[PDB]
Amino acid sequence: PQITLWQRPLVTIKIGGQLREALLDTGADDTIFEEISLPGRWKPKMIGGIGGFIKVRQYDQIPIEICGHKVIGTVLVGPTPANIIGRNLMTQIGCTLNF
């Protein structure tokens, strides 16, 4: 579907049996969620943002449904104020920018 930018580009996604809304963020290399429960092993990691850096957990090969699209990738879990779908996953649903 095509989405204009008069409003924040929110998408509904399913991950680990949980439902959430996330922002399609072309300005984000990675995908991060605020508190969700994911299983298994992860690794420590720090993300750099506009206001500074945050410490997150890094999970790989995590199944994720973005607008009905099934894909798998690396998902970070950390203290973000907004759930974000990054380029690492937007690339997987074929999402592009147009103008």
Ligand X SMILES: CC(C)c1nc(CN(C)C(=O)N[C@H](C(=O)N[C@@H](Cc2ccccc2)C[C@H](O)[C@H](Cc2ccccc2)NC(=O)OCc2cncs2)C(C)C)cs1
Token reading at 22? 């996330």
Q: Which of these ranges, 12-20, 22-30, 37-45, 57-65, lies near a copy of itself under the rule CB under 8 A?
A: 22-30
- Give the residue with the Cβ less far from ligand X, 68 or 79: 79
Which residues make Cβ contacts (< 8 Å) with residue 5, sequence separation at least 6?
none
Do the strands 52-66 and 10-15 form a parallel or antiparallel pair, or are they unpaired?
Answer: antiparallel
DSSP state letters, 50-91: TTEEEEEEEEEEEEEEETTEEEEEEEEES--SS-EE-HHHHG
Q: Which does 36 bind (CB under 5 to 8 A by kind): ligand X, a copy of itself, none?
A: none
Minimum CB separation from ligand X for residue 12, in Å?
15
Which residues of this protein are in contact with a copy of itself, per CB under 8 A? 1-6, 8-9, 23-29, 32, 47-54, 67, 69, 80-82, 84, 87, 90-91, 93-99
* Catalytic site positions: 25
